[PDB]
Symmetry: D2
Subunit: 284 residues, 4 copies
């Protein structure tokens, strides 16, 4: 049996909320209806929050602009902790000049541009420049010819002893009510089905992003990890990750974990959320 | 230590040879030089042979035509036993009319054309005809847009309770001296990394093709399974497959199993060949 | 969709029935009540049967004797086709003298012996004789010390280039209504989790036992693949194997596939039985 | 390419060294000869150290005592960061009273003892106490009967929705020059081969222990991630974890990564250490 609790009822226990984005705040057809009231509410209550997301397809500033376009003005770039920030820091620290090859769009790659390094798509790599490729990043499922560039990526990683990096996204994402699409994490998975495990994956259920947020909160208040709530739709990323780091966790049913499957999934993985809620929408 | 034996020196022990094609008779740049003499030799000695191949991208007649183009005229379509034959028989028997969806080229699909069923590429499947799709076959890595149609195949299989069939090819094939290409079996492998295991795979190391050839030999001579030699470059398909069926096996070193790696791969898999030879090419 | 049919109604189409044993003829509770009616009916109708089983824990004669002890005298050793028989033949034809080491009971091992072979349990292997050990077979989850001999097995296979062989059983089997036990196939799975894929697996869904039965039947009568029904409770062994070999398949719901899960398991695997039936027990 | 450097030459960059223990400070043969020099030198230079180890079979105090018994007094309990400490914290913060079941020895369970939870071995769990079991921990590959308690463990986890917890050890460890033993992490791996992924795994390559050490250091001094070197013998735990956390890494060749295999293993994994050294043992 599941005890379903209202999200509003939980909020007084916590000094900060960590929200996953997809399946929690928004879905394939935009924001979940009413989700603005959640952020109005937290503001009115003076409650801190962050978005903690395994999206490295654009910068925090751009992720924040997408919410502003959808009308959620409360969410600023400083509130968005994304695994792309980890990737960027890893490249700056661990890659010594040359070229970083990427699978994705030019826009996805612009966030990573820096001094000393040239970003190039996999499509632009051949024998004439392969010796300068010092890393591979997988950023977005769109923006390149798969037949051409998945093939080239396989050969690039056979020929160059370099880090291959992706955000730990789900393997697929919902595109319509009926259809899913293969995500950038899934493109890595498919590559790894041919080559073996090979990708450094950043993001949940790792705890670096959580530690960053936690540290920033500790700079301005008394707070312990159990006084933070991680809110997510996915057991093996949001809930598992939150739990390992010591966060309380709330599973919402508006995403990857459907109500009919929750007990079964919880029982097969042994990943137990602190709380289960229908959704993160607070009714006005 | 490996005992390397001349292929010629083994031939007297055997009443029929089964040859894998790729890595044994031919490679990325055509026929292995001299392989013509092997076939001249077997004729002059009156020794039977078949080619037993997991290539289901063409009919046996077209597979034979490819050898004719390359100058190997003695290879006839009756000597080519291909996993595409199994696929064809499976469709005829187990699929009841409607549409068979495919990933490949129109030419790869032609061999499977039959009464009652329409072959269509996954690209031509939509809500208007999906309810009539009764099987999916993976035939060739070329001939379709991977971004579009790998996504559509994921969704097709999520929506239709139908058999998904592929030839059990290696996940990759050599394209040049340095580069490989993802093969149709590898495409299935990639799909399966997203969906889970889901493809019915035909061909080596299964034993149906062997049994078909064996039964034909038995109709014209006294022969036991150990009097047949399976010749291949791949442990987990040719050598494992042959051994399990009772055939003697000869590992050649002209393909997937490189000489520097043979002892290690043999030890790590426990797949032991009866004999190890440098190649299937016979001299003089 | 999920259409259940009468098993008895199906049977006049066929000259021979192949039955899986566990979950079909019997469960942890012993014989399925009334299963004798089925065999009496087939005998009255002039229909043949064979048992096709991946239980290779004892000889066909002892497997038959175990039915006799339970009061089912219609099953005789000459009608039991066990994957143990493939193992025995492999040892005879593909292992050249020396020792064949085993995990199991002495009773499971000794009858596998043939001229030139010595069976030995793993517990008896040492530096002095490891050199003579020419194969490993896993026969029964009982009969050895797990701590000592799973460790010794791991080392044996790291040190010796030998085939490692097991019946393709499910990983676990029901002991009681609530509890399962790890089966011998599961022990192999566990070892492969440490070492990687390493075991030759005999039995369903491979075609070898099916071919043997079919060969024998065709000597005694005019029989096609259209006149043989394969009856099983497990999709990925019984149903998949039968389908690939060209047989009609009947999934029964007295074993691994429960009525409440059948539709979803068929959908997820894409393994579609020709017919679904509650039981292989007929009335009257 | 593979450039070996002097370990001692590296050390002046750093304010603190994090050492892995097995394969770095000691092997199956005991302490690496001369390893005391290394700690003497760091102390002389005013440099700090911590041990960062996925050995959670004993408490930090017992782990330090084991060094003292071998004559290495420079390692003290307060400098040992063990993944056992994360397990302890997880049990305290996330497990609400009741029983914690364990696989291991009584001594290994001892440090986990707390006010509110009873420790009991899996062997002690039956129908009378099972509803009170609120977690399982795997602690040590010794101390239990594998046949009875691995079977019981599989049933325990099938029946109770509880977290299953293990240190992320390698699957095996060396006993002697020729033989390995299955480690506690490998036992979890085996269980997961039967049940599917099911264990929470603590330790490298996770960031948690790294974060702890760093948090402690930054209280006592001005220290950045650029002034900490992680030293280990295993790519997928030590080097990978160190790198993802933003640390310089040193691969040493005294343990799991041998000098003959380093270049190949680095190439296949894409896990690249900042530095490669023969040994953490310095001269003088
Ligand atoms: Cl997200
Ligand atoms: Cl692989
Ligand atoms: Cl990773
Ligand atoms: Cl993270
Ligand atoms: Cl071929
Ligand atoms: Cl080739
Ligand atoms: Cl999956
Ligand atoms: Cl298959
Ligand atoms: Cl076949
Ligand atoms: Cl059975
Ligand atoms: Cl006996
Ligand atoms: Cl050997
Ligand atoms: Cl096999
Ligand atoms: Cl350690
Ligand atoms: Cl974990
Ligand atoms: Mg989500
Ligand atoms: Mg080949
Ligand atoms: Mg069964
Ligand atoms: Mg180590």
């Amino acid at each position: 049996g599941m005890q379903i609790e209202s999200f509003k009822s939980l909020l007084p226990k916590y000094k900060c909320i960590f929200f996953d984005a997809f399946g929690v705040l928004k879905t394939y057809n935009g924001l979940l209806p009413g989700i603005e009231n959640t952020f109005d509410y937290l503001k009115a209550q003076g409650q801190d929050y962050y978005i903690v997301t395994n999206d490295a397809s654009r910068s925090p500033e751009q992720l924040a602009d997408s919410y502003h376009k959808l009308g959620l003005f409360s969410i600023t770039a400083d509130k968005i902790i994304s695994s792309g920030m980890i990737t960027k820091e890893y490249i700056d620290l661990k890659v010594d000049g040359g070229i970083v090859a990427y699978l994705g769009t030019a826009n996805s790659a612009n966030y990573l541009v820096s001094d000393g390094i040239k970003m190039l798509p996999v499509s632009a790599i051949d024998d004439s420049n392969i010796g300068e490729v010092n890393a591979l990043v997988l950023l977005d499922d769109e923006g390149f010819n798969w037949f051409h560039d998945l093939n080239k990526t396989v050969n690039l990683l056979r020929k160059r002893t370099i880090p291959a990096i992706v955000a730990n996204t789900d393997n697929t994402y919902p595109l319509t009510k009926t259809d899913v699409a293969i995500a950038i994490g899934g493109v890595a998975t498919m590559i790894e089905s041919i080559l073996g495990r090979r990708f450094i994956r950043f993001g949940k259920p790792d705890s670096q992003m959580f530690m960053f947020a936690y540290d920033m909160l500790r700079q301005k208040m008394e707070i312990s990890k159990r006084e933070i709530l991680m809110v997510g739709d996915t057991l093996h990323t949001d809930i598992l990750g939150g739990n390992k780091f010591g966060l309380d966790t709330a599973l919402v049913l508006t995403g990857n974990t459907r109500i009919d499957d929750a007990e079964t999934k919880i029982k097969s993985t042994g990943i137990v959320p602190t709380h289960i809620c229908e959704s993160a929408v607070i009714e006005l």
